[PDB]
């Protein structure tokens, strides 16, 4: 679990969104596994605006942060799960590292701020849903 809080927005994995998230829906994209809902309180997270390919992510299944190199956002095949059939997930970045499903929502951060959140995993790789292109999160 986990979310990004920036301005009056909350960014979560779409497959973990709550009833309140859907009742205050701002934007959602099944192909990216993202959902953004509105909040009443102000968010203070800083979103990175860059092309970094190195950062640190939080892994709840190890209670640890790991430094990683990660690929540029791209269209990646994701095998079927209880939340989606087998499909291409867009704007996904991969790194060599550990993750389990409950790790979804952990933040990946570079020197510039929040890059994205844990979204996929398996075969010793971890995938992060990029949020650097969502320029509207800051206005
Ligand atoms: C973070 N993580 C996720 C998994 N398992 S998964 O890749 O099957 N995952 C299950 C939950 C939905 C995910 C998606 N974005 O389609 C895929 C293992 N580690
Ligand atoms: Zn960066």
UniProtKB/Swiss-Prot annotation:
Source species: Coxsackievirus A16 (strain G-10)
Domain of life: Viruses
Subunit structure: Homodimer.
Known catalytic reactions: Selective cleavage of Tyr-|-Gly bond in the picornavirus polyprotein
Section covered of the full-length record: 869 to 1007 of 2193
General function of this protein: Cysteine protease that cleaves viral polyprotein and specific host proteins. It is responsible for the autocatalytic cleavage between the P1 and P2 regions, which is the first cleavage occurring in the polyprotein. Also cleaves the host translation initiation factor EIF4G1, in order to shut down the capped cellular mRNA translation. Inhibits the host nucleus-cytoplasm protein and RNA trafficking by cleaving host members of the nuclear pores. Counteracts stress granule formation probably by antagonizing its assembly or promoting its dissassembly.
Binding, Zn(2+) 1: 50, 52, 110, 112
Protein name according to UniProt: Protease 2A
Catalytic center residues: 15, 33, 104
């Amino acid at each position: 679990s986990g979310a990004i809080y920036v301005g009056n927005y909350r960014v979560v994995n779409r497959h973990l969104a709550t009833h309140n998230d859907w009742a205050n829906l701002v934007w959602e994209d099944s192909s990216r596994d993202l959902l953004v809902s509105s909040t009443t309180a102000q968010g203070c997270d800083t979103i990175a605006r860059c092309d970094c390919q190195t950062g640190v992510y939080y892994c709840s299944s190890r209670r640890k942060h790991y430094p990683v190199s990660f690929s540029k956002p791209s269209l990646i095949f994701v095998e079927a799960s209880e939340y989606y059939p087998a499909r291409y997930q867009s704007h996904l970045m991969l790194a060599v590292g550990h993750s389990e499903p409950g790790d979804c929502g952990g933040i990946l951060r570079c020197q510039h701020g929040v890059v994205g959140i844990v979204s996929t995993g398996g075969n010793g790789l971890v995938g992060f849903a990029d949020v650097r292109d969502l320029l509207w999160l800051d206005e």
